[PDB]
């Protein structure tokens, strides 16, 4: 999956960024079974004051998580993943839950590419990884914390 | 909902940003009944020359709106909404309608979380808002303009 | 279509941005028939180390391409399109494919707006251009490379 995380510039230190990204990555892995290295967290930082709620300009506490996933998972599983991302990002950023928005969008895996390769269906991460070439597997393995 | 608003850096002044956020939030609340405080506008500024049309680099005047909605509204409604957003953003930004692009994407409300809570179906935000923790109503109420 | 391209600041020179936008645009045109000037490439830059893969901060190499299309094309065509953007962006940015990620999302054309007009269905672009005003046609014609 890709998680776009929109935050206010300098609201998260490098450490907080690391922690929030490990929080989402672990949640995704623990609930879906997708390998760690298939989960991308991409921080989009903007100047604080670039976020309006009901027209009211915000300080710098709002986090928006747009998660882009393969289709095929249940409403239930996705609900549990969204709630775990709320809880865990709240703890990682030290930001109260009222500031956290999370949207999940899904697409057919056949129109989804990661590391230059088309993704498999959600059950099939193991076979797929096993059939990649050697150097591709090697590159992927180093993106695990 | 969330409206991602991609603009060139230093194209919209803070007052023009406020104006545009208003125009959008007004459009959404007017045409859907969704309470003012559930609509985020999130400005994403890039340096001019980061937008290409047909391979031709642009100046600083393109505006692209990406609206992220709950599923369940009619296409007639959605067309009316996209048209009003074009009109009112064109006026509030003093930008010609030929520079404005607007895409709506939709998701099940069961996988959309705002203020740390799961969103209702599009007609039912009243009873959703009533049944909430007193402090959550209190915070939500402040983000209205 | 709108292709959102998430890259790191300093990664692509101006000349490389041009070459990448050109390759994406020529791929979309050559495989779907949509006129050049309808294709937007929007580069979003963030400082290096904003991307995490599997919880491990990356340098500045990864390229994420989020293409927003209208519905109604085959999975065969979308697979060819994604693979060709991978190949032509890898060549044009002189980046290895293992850094390239590509997601296609689709929406009904009735909720999509380019140059302030509503898009047609994917093969009716000719009649659609032939019912636009003179000045709109001229403005769109200047966006061809």
Biggest chain contact:
A-C, 38 and 35 residues
CATH superfamily of chain A: Macrophage Migration Inhibitory Factor
Coarse shape of chain A: globular
Oligomer: homotrimer
The domain tally of chain A reads 1
- How do the SSEs of chain A run, as a string of H and E? EHEEEEHEEEHH
Rg of chain A over CA atoms, rounded to whole Å, is 16 Å
Give the CA-CA distance, first to last residue of chain A: 16 Å
Structural class of chain A: alpha/beta
CATH architecture of chain A: 2-Layer Sandwich
Total strands of chain A: 8
Helix run count of chain A: 4
Largest sheet of chain A: 4 strands, mixed
Helix content of chain A: 25-40%
> What is the name of the CATH topology of chain A?
Macrophage Migration Inhibitory Factor
How big a fraction of the residues of chain A is strand?
A: 25-35%
The level-1 CATH class of chain A: Alpha Beta
Major sheet strand order of chain A: 2-1-5-6
PDB class: hydrolase
Keywords: Tautomerase, cis-CaaD, hydrolase
Assembly: trimeric
Entry title: cis-CaaD Y103F mutant apo
